DNA sequence: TCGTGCTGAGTGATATCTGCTTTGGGTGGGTGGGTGGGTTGAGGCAAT
DNA sequence: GCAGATATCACTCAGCACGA
């Protein structure tokens, strides 16, 4: 039902692995094939997945590695294009500012009505095409990512997709060095640069 | 799709006893209702969301005997650690035998069984219908906050966050302060303001509410 | 130059007649009623 | 007793040839 949209999942950890196996094909082939009780057909599921998970313990412990704190099979975490890590550290200033921000309810932002039109126009008309400068340094970036060691071809494809997506934002038909630099910058700083 | 107990309490207070006996499905799906007032199901044929704006009151007891304060709270009941965190107020009620306490308890239940009213005459119990009218009138009102009380709330939240920096050693400290605690303090303060029928929340309401969040963990975590 | 009585033809209204059930199935019901009848088996999916 | 499909009989009209 989310063909062309963005699927949303709240509690990914609290899900039996039997159901999670379905998502293996969605994120890889963008299609689902069913063959049972005389029905043999494939339904397109060209949708984006946005899932969230919570740590095994009451909080996240920095000491242990990522594969232990969040659950989920290690291989599954590699499929996701970006895997963020947001933690609620305790500080005398961050907490103060957050409290002042969540209590005012009782730096301009574009109206949502115009933003939806913006994204729709960008998604329909623009179609970026990679350039030679992009490839010359994308090979470098991927090989460097693999050298420091989890890092597989899926990461390079994610870099390609992110570089293409960022160019879409600025309404350009060519992906420049800056956009791919931003993509790689985002990827390293998501898991977090210890 | 047939809704369960939670949906029948929409726009009301659901009433749950034996909270321990929930199965896995409810153990996991009660988080949705507690966080976001809606139940979402995407099973075989139904991909809709049930609207359930119901507050939850729950209770549980040891299966066999009495509580053991020395042992962790999770060591006597099956509820997971995550579930107990979401509750705004958590109360641990204890029954410690004692001659003096039981004497008065028996005398009070006894006076009730004799005349169907309170023994003490210091106060007259409020009539039921009048109390319901007052509750409705209070729920009609909608108060608001201000910067002056906001400063007090934020300072109190800062103190609460700092305090938990040392209490994290105990493994049963699921009541560790989080922004949810700040929002709960705000909610309780607004409740007290509603009872006063006023519109502007004052320092009194916030200080009283902070006492009910404190006396609910201190007396029920230290004992 | 023409007027009218006789005839075949065709509808209109009315006479008898058959029929008044009918039917498998739950968006036809059970105040329509069982002498009007309805007698599976594999495969998929939630609960666990 | 009631509606519908069907066939029966009786009555009246336009043409025709002759006589006025």
Swiss-Prot record, chain A:
Encoding gene, per UniProt annotation: MCM4
Localization per Swiss-Prot or TrEMBL: Nucleus
Shown segment, full-protein numbering: 623 to 836 of 933
Family indicated by similarity: Belongs to the MCM family.
Role noted for this protein: Acts as a component of the MCM2-7 complex (MCM complex) which is the putative replicative helicase essential for 'once per cell cycle' DNA replication initiation and elongation in eukaryotic cells. The active ATPase sites in the MCM2-7 ring are formed through the interaction surfaces of two neighboring subunits such that a critical structure of a conserved arginine finger motif is provided in trans relative to the ATP-binding site of the Walker A box of the adjacent subunit. The six ATPase active sites, however, are likely to contribute differentially to the complex helicase activity.
Superkingdom, taxonomy of origin: Eukaryota
Subunit comment: Component of the MCM2-7 complex. The complex forms a toroidal hexameric ring with the proposed subunit order MCM2-MCM6-MCM4-MCM7-MCM3-MCM5; loaded onto DNA, forms a head-head double hexamer.
Further remarks about this protein from its record: Present with 8800 molecules/cell in log phase SD medium. Early fractionation of eukaryotic MCM proteins yielded a variety of dimeric, trimeric and tetrameric complexes with unclear biological significance. Specifically a MCM467 subcomplex is shown to have in vitro helicase activity which is inhibited by the MCM2 subunit. The MCM2-7 hexamer is the proposed physiological active complex.
Short motif Arginine finger, span: 78-81
Name of the protein this chain belongs to: DNA replication licensing factor MCM4
UniProtKB/Swiss-Prot annotation, chain B:
Species assigned in the record: Saccharomyces cerevisiae (strain ATCC 204508 / S288c)
Gene name of the encoded protein: MCM7
Role, per record: Acts as a component of the MCM2-7 complex (MCM complex) which is the putative replicative helicase essential for 'once per cell cycle' DNA replication initiation and elongation in eukaryotic cells. Core component of CDC45-MCM-GINS (CMG) helicase, the molecular machine that unwinds template DNA during replication, and around which the replisome is built.
Family: Belongs to the MCM family.
Binding partners and assembly: Component of the MCM2-7 complex. The complex forms a toroidal hexameric ring with the proposed subunit order MCM2-MCM6-MCM4-MCM7-MCM3-MCM5; loaded onto DNA, forms a head-head double hexamer. Interacts with CSM1 and MCM10.
Keyword tags: ATP-binding, Cell cycle, Cytoplasm, DNA replication, DNA-binding, Helicase, Hydrolase, Nucleotide-binding, Nucleus, Phosphoprotein
Sequence positions that bind ATP 1: 61
Motif (Arginine finger): 85-88
Ligand binding (ATP 2): 86, 180
Main subcellular localisation: cytoplasm
GO cellular component, one term: nucleoplasm
Localisation per UniProt entry: Cytoplasm; Nucleus
Protein name, entry field: DNA replication licensing factor MCM7
Keyword Amino-acid biosynthesis: no
């Amino acid at each position: 039902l989310s063909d062309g949209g963005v699927c949303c999942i709240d509690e990914f950890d609290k899900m039996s692995d039997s159901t999670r196996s379905v998502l293996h094909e969605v994120m890889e082939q963008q299609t689902i094939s069913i063959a049972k009780a005389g029905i043999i057909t494939t339904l397109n599921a060209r949708s984006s997945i946005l899932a969230s998970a919570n740590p095994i313990g009451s909080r996240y412990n920095p000491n242990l590695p990522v594969t232990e704190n969040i659950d989920l099979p290690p291989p599954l975490l590699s499929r996701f294009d970006l895997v963020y890590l947001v933690l609620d550290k305790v500080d005398e200033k961050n907490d103060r500012e957050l409290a002042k921000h969540l209590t005012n309810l009782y730096d301009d932002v574009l109206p949502v009505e115009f933003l939806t039109m913006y994204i729709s126009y960008a998604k329909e008309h623009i179609h970026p095409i990679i350039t030679e400068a992009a490839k010359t340094e994308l090979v470098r970036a991927y090989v460097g990512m693999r050298k420091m060691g989890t890092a597989t071809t899926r990461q390079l494809e994610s870099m390609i997709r992110l570089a293409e997506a960022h160019a879409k934002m600025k309404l350009k038909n060519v992906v420049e060095l800056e956009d791919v630099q931003e993509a790689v910058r985002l990827i390293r700083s998501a898991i977090k640069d210890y | 799709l047939e809704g369960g107990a939670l949906v029948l309490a929409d726009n009301g207070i659901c009433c749950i006893d034996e909270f321990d006996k929930m199965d896995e499905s409810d153990r996991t799906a009660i988080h949705e209702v507690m966080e976001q007032q809606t139940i979402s199901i995407s099973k075989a044929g139904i991909n809709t969301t049930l609207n359930a704006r119901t507050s939850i009151l729950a209770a549980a007891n040891p299966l066999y005997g009495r509580y053991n304060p020395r042992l962790s709270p999770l060591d006597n009941i099956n509820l997971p650690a995550a579930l107990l965190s979401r509750f705004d107020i958590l109360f641990l009620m204890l029954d410690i035998p004692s001659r003096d306490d039981d004497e008065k308890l028996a005398e009070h239940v006894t006076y009730v069984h004799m005349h169907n009213k309170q023994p003490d005459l210091d106060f007259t119990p409020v009539e039921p219908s009048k109390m319901r009218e007052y509750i409705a009138y209070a729920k009609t009102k909608r108060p608001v906050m201000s910067e002056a009380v906001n400063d007090y709330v934020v300072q109190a939240y800062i103190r609460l966050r700092q305090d938990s920096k040392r209490e994290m050693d105990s493994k049963f400290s699921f009541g560790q302060a989080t922004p949810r605690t700040l929002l709960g303090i705000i909610r309780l303060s607004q409740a007290l303001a509603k009872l006063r029928l006023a519109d502007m929340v004052d320092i009194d309401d916030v200080e009283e509410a902070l006492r009910l969040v404190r006396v609910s963990k201190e007396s029920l975590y230290q004992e």
